[PDB]
Amino acid sequence: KLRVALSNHLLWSKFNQHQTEMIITKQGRRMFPFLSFTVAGLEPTSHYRMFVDVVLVDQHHWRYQSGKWVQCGKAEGSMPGNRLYVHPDSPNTGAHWMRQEVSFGKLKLTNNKGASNNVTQMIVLQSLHKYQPRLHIVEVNDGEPEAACSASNTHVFTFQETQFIAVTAYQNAEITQLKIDNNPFAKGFREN
Amino acid sequence: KLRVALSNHLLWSKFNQHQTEMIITKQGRRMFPFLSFTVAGLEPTSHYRMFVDVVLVDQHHWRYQSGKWVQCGKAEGSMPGNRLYVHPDSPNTGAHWMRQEVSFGKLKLTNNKGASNNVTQMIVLQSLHKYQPRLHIVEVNDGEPEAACSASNTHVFTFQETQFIAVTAYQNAEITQLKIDNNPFAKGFREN
DNA sequence: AATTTCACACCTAGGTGTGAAATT
DNA sequence: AATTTCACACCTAGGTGTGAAATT
DNA sequence: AATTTCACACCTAGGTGTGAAATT
DNA sequence: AATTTCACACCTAGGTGTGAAATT
Per-domain boundaries in chain A:
1-192
CB-CB neighbours of A34 under 10 Å: 15
- Say how far apart CA A72 and CA A60 lie, in whole Å: 7
Indicate the DSSP class of residue B113: S
Instruction: Please indicate if any CB of chain B lies within 8 Å of the CB of A119.
Output: yes
Whole-number Å distance, CA B173 to C1' E2? 18
Residues 6+ apart with CB under 8 A from A185: none
Buried b (16+ CB within 10 A) or exposed e, B62-71: bebeeeeeee
- Positions of E strands within B25-178: 29-30, 36-39, 47-56, 61-65, 68-72, 85-86, 92-93, 102-103, 108-110, 123-124, 130-139, 156-158, 164-167
Provide, as residue numbers in chain A, all residues whose Cβ is less than 8 Å from the Cβ of B141: 79
Question: Number of C-alpha atoms within 13 angstroms, CB side, residue B95?
Answer: 2
Nearest to A81 among B56, B82, B91 (CB): B91
Whole-number Å distance, CA B105 to C1' E13? 13
Cα-based torsion angle of the residue sequence B35, B36, B38, B39 in order, rounded to the nearest 10 degrees: 50
Least Cα distance to B117 among A49, A103, A88, A115 occurs for A88
- The answer to whether A157 and A135 are in contact (CB under 8 A) is yes
Say whether the CB atom of A174 is under 7 angstroms from strand D: no
- The answer to whether B41 and B19 are in contact (CB under 8 A) is no
Provide, as residue numbers in chain A, all residues whose Cβ is less than 8 Å from the Cβ of B91: 78, 80-82
What is the experimental method? X-ray
B171 min Cα distance to partner chain A (Å): 27
Whole-number Å distance, CA B41 to C1' D22? 47
Query: A1-192: which CATH architecture?
Result: Sandwich (2.60)
Instruction: Please indicate if any CB of chain A lies within 8 Å of the CB of B2.
Output: no
Interface test with B, best of A78, A85, A112, A132 (most B CBs within 10 A): A78
